[PDB]
Structure formats: C-alpha cells, structure tokens
Design a protein around this ligand. Structure first.
Ligand code: ADP
Ligand code: ELN
Ligand code: NA
Length: 266
C-alpha cells in the first residue's frame, strides 16, 4: 500500500540536530525557490541513514514524507530476489506516485549476481531528474560496507549518523511514546532514563507497551469483579513489573564499532 504517512517530527524523541537539517533539506527548495535560482542549486536527490538498529531511521523517512505531503513506498532488502526489472518496476511506481519518498530498507544484507541489482539501482538513480519529485532514502546497520559509488555526487547526497539515544533523548522517547496515554503522576521518566543506559528506542517502546498492557488488563479484571457487588491510569508499579522484562538489544562491542566509525569522519 502507498499512502502519506502519519508519524510527524513530534513522534520522534531526540535527534533534533538531524531534524532541522532534514527540514531545510526539503523546505529550502520550496520556501525559497527564489534563491535556488540565482546561484543555480539542483535540489537534494537523497540521503543514507546509518547506525544501530531500532533508533529511528524508518521514522525519519516517514516523517519526511508526512512533512512534504508525499506518498511513502517502502521496499525491504532481501525481497529484491527472484530479476533485475524489479529495480525498474519499483522506480516506475514511485515516479507514478510523485510527490514520493522511496525508502530502501535493510540492505546491508545485499552488501554481503547481487553484483548489479546495485548497478541497476545506480543506473535507475542517475536517470531520474529532480523534476520527477521523488526523494530516495536508504538505511543500513553496516556502515563499513557501503559501496562508495552510491554516495558519489549526483546520487545519495548525504550520509547521516542516527545513534543510540543519550540520557536526554531517552526521556524524550519515553515522553513521545506516551504523549497520548494517561500516565499516573507518580511516574518519573527522568529516573527511568538514568536506568536505561544503552537501551535503544525500540527497547524503550517495548517497556512502554508492557506497562500499558498491564494497566488495562488490570482494568478489565477489576470491574469484572466489582460488578459482582473515570479513566484508569498507567502507574509506577506497572512500569516496575514491565522492567523485569527489560535489557538492551545492542551489545557493547557493536556500540564501539559504530562509535569508531562515526568519529573518524569527524
Ligand atoms: N527516536 C525515537 N523516538 C520514538 N520512538 C522510537 C525512536 N527510535 C525508535 N523508536 C521505536 O522503535 C521502533 C523501531 O524504530 P525504526 O525507526 O524502525 O528503527 P530503524 O529503522 O533504525 O531500525 C519505532 O517504531 C519506535 O516505536
Ligand atoms: N565484528 C563484526 C561485524 C558485526 O557483526 N556487526 C557490526 C559491524 C559493523 C558495525 Cl559499524 C557495527 C556492528
Ligand atoms: Na535495523
């Protein structure tokens, strides 16, 4: 299915550096078209996100579409295998869907025949002007194996690091995930942030989902009882139980590799 996504910049905790750089990447061509003439800038054709898994790459690709009132078409790495006109049939359906975001997910896998399902993507890329109104976003957890041809000028213009959330970003992920839940006043997410060092956004969302299931499973069983003879809330004790089921999903060793990779490019 092809639609305009529903997630907004507001559903994303942290990453505010990336957020304002993404906005001006798409807002500048349309808010000052009258200065993109004078000096002769050809607008951005694409970006590439890299970093640990479950830290917001897919959400910023949807949020970019929601901001541009664009359709979103999401194709996932291994399903490109049967088979080269696949790379031409998804591109035509995105051209058909303009204005559109084409999202290439999980193809660190492709980076190890498969040889030129890459080159068919690079040739499809170079043969699609900015005038078609398609914006390509790619994502990977293996930044050590990008073939640097996809980042040559004319293709995926920028490479952006989407890292594990620091203490201040965990408070914002928790707040953004519960923005529309009735959470009890005794709940302190600042304290929940200090206790979740190394947790990804995915991990933080899970903890939010378990406390939610408990607070309403408790709701059904109680007035099922108090009918034998007013909104309920998620409380501090629902979050306590929900944390026995809680530990990180990204290892310390792989956290060092990402930190080494991002840091060497300043
Ligand atoms: N920065 C964030 N703010 C709020 N929720 C997040 C954040 N990062 C991850 N999540 C949660 O984890 C889920 C998976 O994230 P996703 O963006 O698909 O990760 P990636 O694409 O980096 O593998 C999201 O749907 C969301 O529930
Ligand atoms: N060792 C090894 C490879 C591995 O399994 N994962 C991995 C590879 C690169 C980065 Cl930058 C992060 C994690
Ligand atoms: Na991932």
């Amino acid at each position: 299915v092809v639609e305009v996504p529903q997630v907004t910049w507001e559903d994303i905790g942290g990453l505010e550096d990336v957020k304002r750089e993404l906005q001006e990447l798409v807002q500048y061509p349309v808010e000052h078209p009258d200065k993109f003439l004078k000096f002769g800038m050809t607008p951005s054709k694409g970006v590439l996100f890299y970093g640990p898994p479950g830290c917001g790459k897919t959400l910023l690709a949807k949020a970019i579409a929601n901001e541009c009132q664009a359709n979103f078409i999401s194709i996932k790495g291994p399903e490109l295998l049967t088979s080269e006109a696949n790379v031409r049939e998804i591109f035509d359906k995105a051209r058909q869907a303009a204005p559109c975001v084409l999202f290439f997910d999980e193809l660190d896998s492709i980076a190890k025949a498969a040889d030129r399902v890459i080159n068919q993507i690079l040739t499809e890329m170079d043969g699609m002007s900015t005038k078609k109104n398609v914006f390509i976003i790619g994502a990977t957890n293996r930044p050590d194996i990008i073939d640097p041809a996809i980042l040559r000028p004319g293709r995926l213009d920028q490479l952006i690091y989407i890292p594990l959330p620091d203490e201040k970003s965990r408070v914002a992920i928790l707040k953004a995930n519960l923005r529309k839940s009735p959470v009890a006043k005794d709940v302190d997410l600042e304290f929940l942030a200090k206790m979740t060092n190394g947790f990804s956004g995915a991990d933080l969302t899970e903890i939010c989902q378990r406390a939610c299931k408990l607070a309403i499973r408790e709701s059904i069983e109680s007035e099922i009882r108090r009918e034998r003879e007013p909104v309920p809330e998620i409380r501090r004790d629902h979050f306590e139980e929900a944390m026995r089921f809680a530990r990180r999903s990204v290892s310390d060793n792989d956290i060092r590799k990402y930190e080494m990779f991002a840091q060497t490019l300043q």
